[PDB]
Design a protein around this ligand. Structure first.
Ligand SMILES: [Zn+2]
Length: 793
C-alpha cells in the first residue's frame, strides 16, 4: 500500500536526515523545551507513576508551575522504563525518537480524517502529503525535538477524524456497546489532545460549531441531528473523564495550566450537546410546529441557546517556505470544497471547512501556531488532486505534471530543512556539564532534582527550599539547559519567567545584565540570591537589544544602547558616523550598529566584553572554546596579535557587507572592542585587548576581600592590577581604580590565588598609589568571607 512509501519518506526525513545533528558529541535534544520535557520525564520516571505540577528548580527562587502536559511526560516516562533508559544519554536517545515517531504516525489520523470526509483515493494522497510538508510542523517533528507540538497536531486531527467516524454509523439506532466504542474512542482522542496541551479544550467549541451549523442550516444540510448530538454527549463525557484526574493541579482557573476550567469546558460541552439532542426531539415531535414557529423553530431555539451561553460567559513566500506548493494546492481545495458542499450539501465536508476557517480566524499572523495549518494544507491538496485525477481517470500523464508541481518543491524544502537540528552548541553543553561538577552542593542538587515537589497555592514569594540553595543568572533562553544539564537553578526561563525589568525595579535577568553600575546589579543579585552568572556571545551581541527592550519597557528607550556605524567613504577613507545620515552616499557601510557609550557601562559589557574587569564582586571561573569562525581563523591568525586580529575582523566585515550581511558574532565582539578603544576609552579608563574570547563565560558572585589603608596627598586615586589566565590559555588584565577619601582608600578584590577554579590570576595584585607600589596575594577564604585587609600606601 501507498501508506508504507510515505511512511519511509517520513522516516528518511525525520530520523535519517538530522541523525548526525542529534547523535554528536553528546545526544543532543533540540531547542529549549525538549530539555524541559527531559527534566520532567526523568523526575517522573523516578517517582513513577506520579509527576510534579510545580518545579522550584526553575524560575529561582520562586519556582514555576508546569504547564507541560501529562501525555508526553507519561509517554516519555513509559518509553524510558520500557527500554530501561531512565537518565542521561540513554534517556535522551529514547526521547529523541518520540517526535519523529509521532510525525510518522501522523499518517493514520490524516488518512482517517480525509477518508471520513471524502473517499479513499484522497486519503492516500493525503497521508503522502503530510509525510513531506515542511515548515514548523516538520521542524518540531524531527529526531530530538521532543516537544508537544507534534502531538497537538496528531490528537487534534485524530479527534476530528474519529469524531466524524462516530457520525458515520451511529445513525438510526443499532446504540450498543460495539457502536459505543466509536464515540468512546473519539472522546479519548479529545482527552489526549487536552492532556498534550492544556489549551486543547479549544477543540470543544470547534466541534460544537459543527452542531450549531448542522442545526441552523437543517434546511440545506442533512444530518441525523439526534445521533450527531448523542455522539457528542458521549465524546464530551468521555473526554471529561479522561481529563478529570488532572483537573486539580493548578490553584485557580487557567486556559494553559491543568485546572478545572478545562473540565468545565468538556462537561459543559456535554451538556450543550444534550440540549441540542433535546432541541431535535422537540422538532421531531412537532413542538415548534404547534407553537407556530414552523421550520424556523429549531434554528431559532439554537440561536437563542447559544446567545444565553454567550451571555453567561459574557459576564507571502514565507508560505512557500512553510508549506511549499501544498499552500496553493491546498488553497484551491478549500474553494472547491466551499463550492461543492455549496452544491451537494454534506455534513462532514461542512465540518472540515469550519475547522479550516476557525484555524484561519484564530491563528492568523500568529507564527507560533503555523504547524496547525500543516494537516489543513495536506487534506485540501489531497482533495484538489483527487479531483483533477478523477477528471482524467497522454492526459493520463499530465496528471503527473501537476502531481509533481505539488510533491516536488515541497519534498525539496522538507529535505533541506530536515537535515539540520538545533539545541545547545558544544561550548554551552560543556560549560553546563562543567558547572554541574565544579560548583558546590552537587549531590543535593542531584537528589532534589528527582523529588516529587508538592504543588503550592502561590509562587508570588520566594519558595522555601529544603536546603541551602543559590541561583544561576543568565538570559531567559538558557534556563532549560541550565536546569537539565548543569542541574543548577536558573533565575530565568524559556517560559519567560524571571526576566524582570528596570522601569518597575523587578529583579530578574534583564535588570541584572543592563544594569549600569555594580551597586544596582548587586541589589538585583542579592534579591535573587545569585551565586553564578552565565553569559554568552549572543547576550553580548545580537540578543543584547532584546535584553534592553525587556529592561526598559519599549523599543525607543533600548535605542540609547546604540550609536552608528563604521564605513569606508567613496574616496576610500575609513570613518565612524554616530548616525547613518552622516555617511556620504555610495559609502561601503559595515552593517553592524556600534554600541553607544552607555552599553560599555552595562553588566553584560563589563562581564562578557571586559571579562569582568572593574567589578568588585564577580570573578571569571571558566570559559568555553571560541566561536567557530575564530577557532578556524586562529590556525593562521595569532589571537595575541591585536593588529592581525583587527585586520582579519574588518576584512570579514567589509567582505560580508556587500552581501548586505553582518559579521559573525566573534567578529562583532572584536569590532565592539575596537569601537570602545577608539570612541569611548578615557585617559585612564578600563582597557581591553582587541581579541576574541570564549563563546560561553561563567562568573562567580563573591563577597570580595576588602583591601584598605592610608595614602599620602597628593593622591586622589588608588589602582589595582592583575593578569588573569583562562582555561583556554587566554589572558586579560583585571583593573579596578578607587577614589581616595580623607587620605584613605578601600578596594574589594574578587580573585584569589588558591581557588580551585581553572581561571586564575597569574600575578599578584599590583596596587599603585601615586609613587608607592605594592604586591598583594589574596586567599580564597578572605574573598569568600569578605575579610578586611590593612595595607598602608
Ligand atoms: Zn515548544
Amino acid at each position: 500500500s501507498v501508506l508504507v512509501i510515505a511512511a519511509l519518506i517520513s522516516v528518511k526525513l525525520r530520523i535519517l536526515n538530522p541523525w548526525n545533528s542529534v547523535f554528536t558529541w553528546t545526544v543532543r535534544l533540540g531547542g529549549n523545551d525538549p530539555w524541559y520535557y527531559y527534566r520532567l520525564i526523568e523526575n517522573t520516571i523516578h517517582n513513577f507513576p506520579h509527576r510534579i505540577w510545580f518545579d522550584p528548580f526553575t524560575y529561582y527562587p520562586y519556582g514555576s508551575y508546569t504547564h507541560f502536559g501529562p501525555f508526553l511526560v507519561y509517554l516519555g516516562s513509559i518509553a524510558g522504563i520500557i527500554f530501561s533508559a531512565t537518565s542521561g544519554e540513554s534517556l535522551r536517545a529514547v526521547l529523541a525518537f518520540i517526535p519523529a515517531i509521532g510525525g510518522v504516525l501522523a499518517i493514520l489520523p490524516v488518512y482517517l480524517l480525509t477518508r471520513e470526509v471524502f473517499d479513499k483515493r484522497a486519503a492516500v494522497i493525503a497521508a503522502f502529503l503530510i509525510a513531506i510538508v515542511p515548515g514548523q510542523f516538520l521542524q518540531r517533528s524531527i529526531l530530538g525535538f521532543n516537544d508537544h507540538h507534534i502531538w497537538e497536531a496528531f490528537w487534534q486531527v485524530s479527534a476530528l477524524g474519529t469524531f466524524l467516524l462516530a457520525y458515520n454509523r451511529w445513525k438510526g439506532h443499532d446504540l450498543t456497546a460495539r457502536q459505543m466504542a466509536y464515540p468512546v474512542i473519539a472522546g479519548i482522542t479529545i482527552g489526549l489532545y487536552v492532556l498534550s496541551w492544556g489549551a486543547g479544550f479549544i477543540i470543544a467549541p470547534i466541534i460544537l460549531a459543527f452542531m450549531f451549523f448542522a442545526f441552523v442550516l437543517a434546511g440545506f444540510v442533512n444530518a441525523d441531528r439526534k445521533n450527531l448530538s448523542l455522539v457528542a454527549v458521549v465524546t464530551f463525557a468521555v473526554s471529561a473523564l479522561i481529563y478529570l484526574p488532572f483537573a486539580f493541579n493548578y490553584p485557580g482557573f487557567s486556559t494553559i495550566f491543568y485546572s478545572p476550567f478545562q473540565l468545565l469546558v468538556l462537561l459543559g460541552s456535554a451538556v450543550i450537546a444534550a440540549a441540542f439532542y433535546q432541541i431535535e426531539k422537540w422538532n421531531d415531535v412537532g413542538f415548534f410546529e404547534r407553537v407556530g414557529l414552523g421550520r424556523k423553530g429549531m434554528p431559532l431555539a439554537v440561536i437563542v441557546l447559544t446567545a444565553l451561553i454567550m451571555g453567561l460567559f459574557f459576564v507571502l513566500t514565507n508560505a512557500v517556505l512553510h508549506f511549499g506548493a501544498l499552500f496553493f494546492f491546498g488553497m484551491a481545495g478549500i474553494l472547491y470544497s466551499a463550492y461543492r458542499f455549496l452544491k451537494r450539501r454534506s455534513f462532514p465536508e461542512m465540518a472540515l471547512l469550519i475547522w479550516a476557517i476557525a484555524m484561519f480566524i484564530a491563528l492568523w499572523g500568529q507564527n507560533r501556531f503555523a504547524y496547525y495549518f500543516a494537516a489543513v494544507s495536506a487534506v485540501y491538496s489531497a482533495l484538489a488532486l483527487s479531483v483533477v485525477f478523477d477528471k482524467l481517470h497522454f492526459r493520463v500523464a499530465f496528471a503527473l505534471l501537476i502531481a509533481l508541481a505539488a510533491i516536488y518543491p515541497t519534498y525539496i524544502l522538507a529535505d533541506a530543512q530536515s537535515s539540520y537540528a538545533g539545541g545547545p552548541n558544544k561550548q554551552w553543553y560543556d560549560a553546563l556539564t562543567w558547572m554541574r561538577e565544579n560548583t558546590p552542593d552537587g549531590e543535593k542538587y542531584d537528589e532534589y532534582y528527582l523529588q516529587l515537589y508538592p504543588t503550592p497555592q502561590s509562587n508570588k514569594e520566594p519558595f522555601s527550599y529544603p536546603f541551602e540553595t543559590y541561583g544561576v543568572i543568565s538570559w531567559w533562553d538558557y534556563g532549560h539547559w541550565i536546569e537539565a544539564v548543569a542541574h543548577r537553578m536558573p533565575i530565568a526561563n524559556p517560559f519567560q519567567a524571571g526576566i524582570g525589568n528596570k522601569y518597575n525595579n523587578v529583579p530578574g535577568a534583564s535588570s541584572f545584565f543592563t544594569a549600569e553600575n555594580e551597586s544596582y546589579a548587586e541589589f538585583v543579585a542579592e534579591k535573587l540570591n545569585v551565586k553564578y552568572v552565565v553569559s554568552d556571545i549572543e547576550m553580548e551581541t545580537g540578543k543584547y537589544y532584546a535584553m534592553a527592550v525587556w529592561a526598559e519597557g519599549d523599543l525607543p528607550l533600548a535605542e540609547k544602547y546604540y550609536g552608528g556605524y563604521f564605513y569606508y567613504s567613496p574616496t576610500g577613507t575609513f570613518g565612524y558616523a554616530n548616525s547613518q545620515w552622516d555617511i556620504p552616499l555610495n559609502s561601503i557601510i559595515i552593517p553592524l550598529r556600534i554600541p553607544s557609550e552607555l552599553y560599555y557601562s552595562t553588566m553584560e559589557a563589563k562581564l562578557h566584553l571586559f571579562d569582568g574587569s572593574g567589578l568588585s564582586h564577580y570573578r571569571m571561573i571558566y570559559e568555553s572554546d571560541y566561536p567557530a569562525e575564530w577557532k578556524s581563523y586562529s590556525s593562521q591568525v595569532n589571537l595575541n596579535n591585536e593588529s592581525q586580529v583587527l585586520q582579519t575582523a574588518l576584512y570579514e566585515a567589509v567582505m560580508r557587507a556587500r552581501y548586505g550581511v553582518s559579521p559573525t558574532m566573534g567578529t562583532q565582539e572584536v569590532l565592539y572592542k575596537y569601537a570602545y578603544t577608539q570612541l569611548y576609552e578615557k585617559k585612564m579608563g578600563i582597557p581591553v585587548k582587541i581579541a576574541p574570547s570564549g563563546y560561553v563565560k561563567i562568573f562567580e558572585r563573591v563577597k570580595g576581600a576588602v583591601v584598605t589603608g592610608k595614602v599620602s596627598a597628593n593622591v586622589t586615586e588608588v589602582s589595582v592590577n592583575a593578569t588573569i589566565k583562562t582555561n583556554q590559555n587566554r589572558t586579560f588584565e583585571y583593573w579596578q581604580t578607587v577614589e581616595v577619601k580623607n587620605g584613605t582608600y578601600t578596594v574589594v578584590l574578587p580573585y584569589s590565588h588558591n581557588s580551585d577554579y581553572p581561571v586564575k590570576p597569574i600575578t599578584p595584585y599590583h596596587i599603585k598609589a601615586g609613587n608607592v607600589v605594592k604586591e598583594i596575594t589574596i586567599y580564597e577564604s578572605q574573598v569568600q568571607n569578605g575579610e578586611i585587609i590593612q595595607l598602608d600606601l
